[PDB]
Curated annotation (Swiss-Prot), chain A:
There is a cross-link at residues 1, 34 (Glycyl lysine isopeptide (Lys-Gly) (interchain with G-Cter in SUMO2)). Regulatory subunit of the ATP-dependent NoRC-1 and NoRC-5 ISWI chromatin remodeling complexes, which form ordered nucleosome arrays on chromatin and facilitate access to DNA during DNA-templated processes such as DNA replication, transcription, and repair. Both complexes regulate the spacing of nucleosomes along the chromatin and have the ability to slide mononucleosomes to the center of a DNA template. Directly stimulates the ATPase activity of SMARCA5 in the NoRC-5 ISWI chromatin remodeling complex. Component of the NoRC-1 ISWI chromatin remodeling complex at least composed of SMARCA1 and BAZ2A/TIP5, which regulates the spacing of histone octamers on the DNA template to facilitate access to DNA. Within the NoRC-1 ISWI chromatin remodeling complex interacts with SMARCA1; the interaction is direct. Component of the NoRC-5 ISWI chromatin remodeling complex (also called the NoRC nucleolar-remodeling complex), at least composed of SMARCA5/SNF2H and BAZ2A/TIP5, which regulates the spacing of histone octamers on the DNA template to facilitate access to DNA. It comes from Homo sapiens. It is found in: Nucleus, Nucleolus. The chain holds residues 1676 to 1727 of 1905 of the full protein. Signal peptide: none annotated. A zinc finger (PHD-type) spans 1-51. Belongs to the WAL family. Expressed at moderate levels in most tissues analyzed, including heart, brain, placenta, lung, skeletal muscle, kidney and pancreas. This is Bromodomain adjacent to zinc finger domain protein 2A.
Amino acid sequence: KVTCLVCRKGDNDEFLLLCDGCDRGCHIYCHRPKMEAVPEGDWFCTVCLAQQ
Amino acid sequence: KVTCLVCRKGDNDEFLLLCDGCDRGCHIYCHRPKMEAVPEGDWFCTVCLAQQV
Ligand SMILES: [Zn+2]
Ligand SMILES: [Zn+2]
Ligand SMILES: [Zn+2]
Ligand SMILES: [Zn+2]
């Protein structure tokens, strides 16, 4: 059940990015820098980025 | 002079993530979700994420 790392909510799930490497998520509107849309391809959360 | 996308400042450059797709940047402390350190390998800014398929 995906939830936003920033605000901790799982609401508005059409706007939740799901990490490609783990179960974590983020609303595009909670992300900084700002994101205007859900991107295609792969998005990695900061925990996954910290492992690469 | 790289500037942060969030706060628009170019200070504390040791804390500035640099995009591998363009010349944009972001302080780790301005990033959300939390970024405690500059990662190794690659980081893409939101403008570049929007070009992916
Ligand atoms: Zn959120
Ligand atoms: Zn992840
Ligand atoms: Zn900044
Ligand atoms: Zn970029």
